[PDB]
Amino acid sequence: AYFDEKLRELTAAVATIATSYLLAHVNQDQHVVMLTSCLPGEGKTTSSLNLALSLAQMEKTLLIDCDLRKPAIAHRFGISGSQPGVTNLLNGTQSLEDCVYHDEQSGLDILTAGVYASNPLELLSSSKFSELLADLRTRYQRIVIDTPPCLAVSDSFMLAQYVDSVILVIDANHTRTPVVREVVGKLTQQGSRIDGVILNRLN
Amino acid sequence: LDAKAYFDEKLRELTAAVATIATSYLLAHVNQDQHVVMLTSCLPGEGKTTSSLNLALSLAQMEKTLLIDCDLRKPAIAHRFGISGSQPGVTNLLNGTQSLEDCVYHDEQSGLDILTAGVYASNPLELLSSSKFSELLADLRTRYQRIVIDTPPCLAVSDSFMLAQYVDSVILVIDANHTRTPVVREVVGKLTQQGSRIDGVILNRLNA
Ligand SMILES: N[C@@H](Cc1ccc(OP(=O)(O)O)cc1)C(=O)O
Ligand SMILES: N[C@@H](Cc1ccc(OP(=O)(O)O)cc1)C(=O)O
């Protein structure tokens, strides 16, 4: 049943235009961009690729899958589970060349989550992670980071230290605003600021 | 320089797709007797082919469906599924070069069956006014639950006024941003003053 997949993913794409516009033409200094939600199932992963796909039109961009717990990016580009990714780099198994997947339908570069890692937050709080991000900055104009939810784990409060912009994805049909207000509060009380929302509408 | 071209194809495709949902619903759940349905416009450039696509694709999820390209003059269907222009289709069948089996292309991403216009033919109205064209339609009726036919614009050539005799329903595709209603009212009259009746509109909105 293809036509409804076409409506869902086409809709998902337009729901990210104003966010993609702002980044491309207003805050051009925001080189590393982090997408997150308060809970699972709010459209965060498809908003991430859709954002990265459009930023790929004007800049050499990288999409990184950083939900090392339930990773989806590799799934949605039809990428191998074999394909080495982010954890592979941090663990020094493979190098960046044998890790980036190039979707040259689009020009986008994709760094998948990589093989399983039982220490996801340990890995992400690494100084091998901060070093990896610093190196990717000097190689890419834009980087888009898919993160796991803000209330499930602490990963994303950890990552936000490292990024230039946080975009908060919200299933406006179901997430309640007092929750959002609390998540915004938790970020504010450690430093990070929210630079924009994406309001998906799911059923 | 920017992503306007990328986002505008998506927005155009999304608007085009959404414009065919109510049409498809009506056919799937209200007018189930209308097995062969014809889409057309008054002029070129009104969204008619992608409306014929999405409609067929959408009917495919509930019924065994066939999309036929019958604009033998400026054909688009084959182009939009990434099918070779070589691929035999309607003209091939009418000219008896190929038979029906190694003519139909199956899009197995979607379940839809597609019959392209086929190789070029300089006798287009000649061919469609054939009897073996009607015999081809009679056979396709017994093989498909729905048949969706993309046809030429009404005011360019007369092909579609001829085709309407063979179909159970005519759907008129309209670029409501640009087509003017007295034009539409005139084309409706031309069908009204022969057999055909219009059973529904699809209102595209385009950005020339
Ligand atoms: N693609 C659909 C639904 C969707 C659901 C979940 C999803 O992934 P996650 O919840 O992990 O962000 C992505 C997309 C939409 O955005 O409308
Ligand atoms: N090519 C655009 C718009 C378009 C589509 C079909 C179309 O058909 P026609 O020119 O025959 O009316 C016209 C314009 C789209 O994919 O929606």
Instruction: Assign the CATH architecture of chain A.
Output: 3-Layer(aba) Sandwich
User: Can you list the strand order of the major beta sheet of chain A?
Assistant: 3-4-2-5-1-6-7
Biggest contact: A-B, 19 and 20 residues
Shape of chain A: globular
* Helix fraction of chain A by DSSP (H/I, runs of at least 4): 25-40%
| β-strand number of chain A | 7
Q: Can you identify the CATH superfamily of chain A? A: P-loop containing nucleotide triphosphate hydrolases
What CATH calls the topology of chain A is Rossmann fold
Percentage of β-strand residues of chain A: 15-25%
The helix/strand series of chain A, from N terminus to C terminus, equals HHEHEHHEEHHEHEHE
Family (chain A): Belongs to the etk/wzc family. Belongs to the CpsD/CapB family.
Subcellular location (chain A): Cell inner membrane
Protein name (chain A): non-specific protein-tyrosine kinase
Domain AAA (chain A): 41-174
